[PDB]
Amino acid sequence: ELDEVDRRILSLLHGDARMPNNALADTVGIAPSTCHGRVRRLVDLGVIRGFYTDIDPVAVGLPLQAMISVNLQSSARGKIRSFIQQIRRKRQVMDVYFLAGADDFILHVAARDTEDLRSFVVENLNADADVAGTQTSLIFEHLRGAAP
């Protein structure tokens, strides 16, 4: 469902997320109106999940990062879609990964201190119907600099 114009738009935006629409529309060889509409369409269809700024090692000021693999009870599995929803709304949570392995999902989280992390685990995980969790320390995370 992607035409080559959308492909050029996506490639250029991948390389320059901050690219002004005039320059983008000109580089693609389209009109600014049509370019903006195409991009809005792309965001709407979920083709672009969003545009983001990669802020710091999170050290300013969430220096403590973690990966929490969560296993739910067998009866609670039916509620999985809901569980993620409410939990995505939580401050500390940045990413959610669903895997095809032993764990139901993994939570990539950021916290201020050990007390903040512990607070997240206790209030959001330990106080619910989920079997268990394994928290492992994140030392650094990096995006990837590869062109499309």
Added chain:
Amino acid sequence: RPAELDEVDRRILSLLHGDARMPNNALADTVGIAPSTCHGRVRRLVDLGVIRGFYIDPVAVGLPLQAMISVNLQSSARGKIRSFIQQIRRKRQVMDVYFLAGADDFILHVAARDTEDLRSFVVENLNADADVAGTQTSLIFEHLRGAAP
């Protein structure tokens, strides 16, 4: 390095976190400073490394199969970890790199078109190098948090 950020820098980072495409004029107006001053401040933030970059097109548009590959290096190869990633990041399939403190040295969030592509990534970029082993696992869904930063 925290604490070398004023309320203006804070407002800038907060506004720019979710909306990387917020125009400089709109940003400066919302923060209540002149656009020139704002540009200097954003440039400042990028320079300090406080802003690592601006980037999220899905993946199913060419790479419908996603994986998480946990890598364990040799005890002798560990010292060069910084270099390893420094190369592995440039590889087309890798989306994320996490350094961990568990048994495995790091985990790689990657995207590939098919299982053969994934297998090729592991063989040619990992298996044919000085790293002890890898465990490649399937990703079914990926999410970011819809929380107001």
